[model samples]
Target: MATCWQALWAYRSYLIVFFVPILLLPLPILVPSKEAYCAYAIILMALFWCTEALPLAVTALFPLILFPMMGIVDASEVAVEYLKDSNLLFFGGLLVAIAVEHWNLHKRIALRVLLIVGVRPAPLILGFMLVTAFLSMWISNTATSAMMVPIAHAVLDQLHSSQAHLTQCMSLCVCYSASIGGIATLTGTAPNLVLQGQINSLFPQNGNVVNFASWFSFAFPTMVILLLLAWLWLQILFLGFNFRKNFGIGEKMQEQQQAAYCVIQTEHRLLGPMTFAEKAISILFVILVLLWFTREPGFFLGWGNLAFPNAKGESMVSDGTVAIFIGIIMFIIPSKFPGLTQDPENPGKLKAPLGLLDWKTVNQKMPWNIVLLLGGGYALAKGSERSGLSEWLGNKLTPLQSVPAPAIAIILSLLVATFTECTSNVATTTIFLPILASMAQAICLHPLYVMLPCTLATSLAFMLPVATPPNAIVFSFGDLKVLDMARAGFLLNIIGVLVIALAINSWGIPLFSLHSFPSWAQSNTTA
Candidate 1:
């Protein structure tokens, strides 16, 4: 009995795994209605996500059982939320990411950039940050970190430093840069898409969709500034720069760099020449991004508007439409190789140009679970809004009504950043945006004041393995410890919170015209 008890407490997740939901059972009972129950479900889910007591996707399903039992929403409505347009958008973006990974196109892009960036200290950091961030803006941050960290290890292999801390520092940059880079575009990360879908759902008819251009404009400044600062922070933390330090070098800085160039080029040469398929895919990628940016046409009149004008296609055909459309085209294109291969299935028969992709390859690599995970979050947001829990919670926190908007923005930014450090950012963004929207209403302020900060804050997690997948993936490389991440992440988290608050309130406010509550949010503006 004593041994069993000892084992039970030995794993904290073992205890908290089941412990959280039970503690939440009587929670909604505090409410006078089903609103209480929905809130309870959210709290339990949030706690489980924080502790990772349950698989994130599984925890997301709580509403399916709890909401219907508690009458927050019916089973069918829950089903509808899980299959929303935003979900489709998510699926489309995920498909493109899988395609990038499947062809090793992502790898080729990284190496080419590294060749350009070279192997000096400052150049190396800048190059890695740029490449990793750029790749992450398209693929999974986990994949980007996993891909880049080992390469950094190879470069570290050529150096003299046996310092574990130095290897750890370089490793941290790959992970952190990937996370930061992912926030620059709508499809860059899960939370970006979550907010993209949430806003469309919450404010369906907002004039300019927060499409590729609009989001990039708002976020690039954030990315560029943060990327440089993070590099400097890491360099200073690990390298200890000095103004008076040794300068002259071909005899010193010369051989090391030349030596590094050899290995980098060696790896670059290993990929051989870029294949015909790679060339074609790269063109399509450029074309797709161009379409994503220009589809709305003119500076703002984009091609989508010109083609469809006022028809269903004009409004119905969205960013998701373009993303998925290109994804479909990928299946049609041939993956031509320079040399012919005898067909495996039909001996002596030439396998013609391989299509850019096949359904099976996509099925194998797609982050299907993440798409569903977002759907579950989408369902939870819908339930919370419908059950009136969002409104009730906002009302309950009436003290915040006295706070000013900017202060509230900063406070909300910090709050969500903190929440995200523990829970899945995807789950956090979906669950909190609706609540923040309601809270904005409760305070009679523009929802953007509260909502925008929280949305951006979802990706601001820099501290823990559980904070974001990039953080988790890098930790798995065994070069970093939780304490290392926690220390560095703590500072980056603070920097991220400050940067986001400043950007949104200053530039973000005018760009989105956030001074007054807009008409779409008016229905919920009632106190």
Candidate 2:
């Protein structure tokens, strides 16, 4: 019986979780209102999402099952939520990332940064974090972590210091920084993209003013602060404040630094010369970023407006348009060495017909699951609104109405942080943002007053490997244990909540104009 119970819990966490919520309705403990059904489905799905009883992607299909069964939303409607323009944007971003990966541009970039980072224990950690964080801001967090681990090992080998604490520190930095860095950009992680989509999907038409630039303005500063704080904490904890005194002289350190540089130089040389492919992709990437930031340049007409001066849709070009523009370019731009040019006369010039990206590479690598998950989140929000469940939940939390907005923001951020420890950050934000939006409405505050902080806090899950893919990937390197991660991550989590809450209350209000409940937020509600 004990073994049976253990197996049941392990393999059936989702089953047990969803079953209880369903049982709540049949037991007559609750009225069978549409809100009740929506609430029931919410709890069931949240539990399944929080636990790994079913794969996250598989669990995301719950709306297809639960919403229709409960008559809260139509089948066709739920399907629409599963795929949106935002999904296309996400897809385009990944294709661009794949282009970078395919041509080894990411590796070249990481190594070059490391070469400049110098081999002092502090600089080494700082360099690793810097590269990992920057790469993660634009690429997949898991890929960033993967790229850094080997680099860390190479640096460690050069240092000749196998101290467990130092190795552990290096390990933690790669994972934690990748997770932290992703908060800086829309393409950085699933949760960021999910939040962006949720905002567009949740609001009235033309309510999507928070483009890449608006998001970066808020997120980039927060990321820098967290990165520096974590860097300092890890430095003191692992290397000791007496590092300069105990770290031995300029003589020995100089030799070590040289050796480390040798290792870095070797890797850089292995990359050979920068190819036309890397150069083209690099230029294209910078152009895309510029377009995203300059799309709505505020006072003067943005480039998008000037470029498409005549349009029914104000400026038909958007961040998504720019992303897809580059994505299509990747396939149009030919690689230098796809095959020798057929014409012998064109030897020095371009040759191969193949573009940088191929369907096979994309099909294999794209995080399609995340796309589905985003859709499910949208569906959940839609059902909540359609069934009047957001208002219902908001009314249920009336006690919070009396609380101060800053305090409420702090508490909401912490709630998201803790919930993320038990599940995917994307799912945690998805599950809570709608409810927070509703709560903000119920309390006569702006939706963003709470929802934005909650959205930021989803990336604050520092304590558990299961909390994020980057954390888990680093943990698998065996330099750090669960306990090691928990101790450091717990403190970092606290720091994250404080930073996010304060930012929302102070800087965020002015940045996003949260002081006045905007007409846009007023656009989305249970009305």
Candidate 3:
């Protein structure tokens, strides 16, 4: 930890060089709207490029202060923008996820899924990907990835005697799959929610917004396609497709099956049957998912002749709400067997049912740093918009009016993808979202068309450990290095870009009802 602090200090000069311009840019309080916007945008982008320090939550605070002082917009309105729906929903969803993990329900689900799926090297890898993707679509990607890492390690241990090389490859595959799978759903990654929030804020009347289920329905096919591609890529690059044919775990499988049977038989006597807490948690999980998908129809679909709302109603149920709701249930449900609960008075005394829910455990396990980091990023985005910096920068990109819409989108996606490889994914998305939206409006294009691609690209940050939490976590396993990740991740990134470009150009735009703006919005094309 001390070394980490020293390393950060060593880079202080670079951080100063990057943030100083941003800090000073707002000093010219009387600058014109157009110029102020331009300066603010450029300076903010430069800050993002430089230090990459300060949790994104802290960086977000800049626009709040700068905007009010620069006289771009009143302080009150800017504060509202910072507290947009995206931030609320994102935080809510995180809380719900915390609850699920708190009850140990997530682990039980994973173990059951693995048992049913079979645990051969390839099947095991695919199972991890499937589980991660499914959970992330409704929860937070970082949380889902963190939870799966330990399970991946456990599976790897099981494979050590059978095929060590395959285990190593499988570990990396789990990380890659988590990142890639996040691209397939709105709530799967922060960038998707950020894009949705910005779009709704900027164009509330567009009449073609992406709702929860609609977004999932559209992106699920993409996830399937990408999952297949990832499987093949890992096979070819890491395991060499031919390696699986000669390798077999028949003998080892039998030995493990026998050992597991023995453990279950012996443990059953002391442990008793699966507890009520476990059953209730499982039932609640299914109910939450059911309600999430069918809440509208189940409640009011057939009551009258009014519009049949989509999964997300006018008073939409946010991911965070669902997450917290389930989290609360974890505490309410009682364990089936007796004596399982931890002793309240003694604090250290063990009970019969062994491990049940405990607030103390939940407090210790939750990733408070990440929550702070996310909040800080939100503050930075709000600060940028508040300062009128986003608009100023958007005006300067008027030259992009000459480029074709598809081409411009491709360029922005590529740029965001490249940048995310070196910075925090959520921070990268928060910074780029407003800039992309402002630029889209200036160039006579729908913000969704430009911003959606960038959001998807943000998940393609597999090229470096610093790119995402999952990459960093997997790196600590010691089976791979920075260069190895870069090489493999570079190829994956290129594949992701191509897949997104094709998906959007050929299918997504039309399906989502995105349209290019008329000529009046462009600098050169006067109405």
Candidate 4:
């Protein structure tokens, strides 16, 4: 691992040179015109896509430098773009999710849902899908999958004595369910939010950023349908030919259940009968999510109908603010178990009635690298916009300006989705958003129409372990090979593309209030 990382780092500079310059191509060297800049931006954006270095987020930073140099936009404006409300909302949601995971609220919820749904094979698969999908609608799919993995393991362990094949199948089901659930909501995965944020930032007036409820309205049905399809497919492909009866080991099954029961009981005891910290975190998280959902209302109610104030003053509900707020709460919560904190001086010992917020534990559990990666990606997006490169690239693509709107929209969405299936979904979105925006503008098409598809397609990263964290994590369990995922994911990817194309063209665009574009934007000049 160290050698691989070292080799990657060695090539890092070359990667930057290849990817970064593409962002600057939008400046139009010999002549300055909207068409020229647009054409240039498209070409450069394409180049950036090819390089695939320094992460998509880091590559996004090219805009910050490129835009200013080309005189397309000021650096300050580009920088401010990174701090949009959409990004904030995502950040806050992540923090709240962390709190939920830290407190085991998510686990309890999953387990309770499972218990209520019953554990029959079909029902178990369906229940897992529904619960994971629902949870993912509000938090990161990666996190949701991680949480579900253990529960699935518990379930499998309990059933192993009676049904080993079922255990294996259920484990795979949980893994796949997590991936499918992530596709259900924008907040369910980083890529979804990243794409949404980029679209909103690029086209503020188009309603490109679907609200929590709106996004759910569009995606939830698709998610449910896909999940059902996935469950049925898994059964037919893996279990149909090799049907088996229960092994008939009730005694061992009971023992496994008892062990799980004992573990839960022990953890409950550790919880120390309802601590204030736990209560406070829970309340705070609820309020934060509410605030996020009601952000527009909050602005209307608080700011008294201000029409587009400065970005900073634009909205109060954001992901970053929520994340930080929840993180702070995590620190404030007292730990329930004593002797957990090993600090010598001023040791913040956890005691009864308020013991769950062990700072040490929280720190240990937090995915800090992920946060850094997210922030870095945000920074890169800001830099790319600031560089005037996105605009320059857009000007370059103006030659293709005659491409029909629907065709362009469909092609862009397909490309984005396909790219996501091979790379980091979040990175793919961050990198493509500005480019897509530039393309939309260059072609004089509705940005939302073009970008929404891209955003939705971010969830189509189902083809490989590298395509999504959930797939990769589950692959680690060893039951499913890379080829197995690829075969299933390839079919799923095609289905996803068709679904997204249909959604955007037949339903999404019409349902949303985006106006039709001018005839020039719709003309297929290539012909």
What do the candidate models score in CA lDDT, each in turn? 0.68, 0.69, 0.59, 0.56
What TM-score would every model get versus the actual structure? Answer: 0.63, 0.59, 0.56, 0.51
Q: What value does the lDDT take at residue 174 in candidate 2? A: 87
Tens-place lDDT digits, model 2, residues 433-489: 676666676656777677778778888878754456555445333455556777788
Query: Could you give the C-alpha RMSD of every candidate to the true structure, in order shown?
Result: 7.9, 9.0, 8.9, 10.3
Model 1 weakest 10-residue run by lDDT: 242-251
> Highest lDDT, which number?
2
Superior by lDDT: candidate 1 or candidate 4: 1
Candidate 1: stretches off by over 4 Å: 1-6, 9-14, 30-32, 94-104, 119-260, 311-315, 337-354, 396-527
Which pairs of residues collide in model 1? 296-301, 296-302, 297-301, 297-302, 297-303, 335-354
What would you estimate as the lDDT of candidate 3?
0.59
Q: Write the per-residue lDDT of candidate 1 for residues 1-527, one digit (tens) a residue.
A: 78987887678877897677677767665655776676676667666655667665577677788777777777887887766555565556556656676677766665565567655565566667888888777655654554465456555654433111567777888888988998887767777777777778877777655778888889989998888889878777766574222221356567566765676677667777777677877787677667755655323566767776675445446666766787888888777645577777769667666678788787776556555565666666667678765455444444676887678877777767765554456655666777666666766677656766777888887864545655644533345555666667777777887888778867887778787677766773383
Give the lDDT of residue 159 in candidate 1.
46
> What is the Å distance of residue 317 in model 1 from its true position?
2.2
Ranking by lDDT: 2, 1, 3, 4
Tens-place lDDT per residue, model 4, 1-527, is 67998897889758676656555654666666644553454345434434444443344455566666766567776566554443443344445555666665654544454445543456566666777767666554555565566556555544343232455566666666776677666556666667656645654564444676677777777777777777767666655543221221356656654565555444434534545445666687567556434434321343312533556665433334545666566655554534344556656863344444555655664444333333333443344444443444334434555777767666666666664543445555666667666666654466667667767777776654434556534532345444555555667666766767676766575556557663333434412
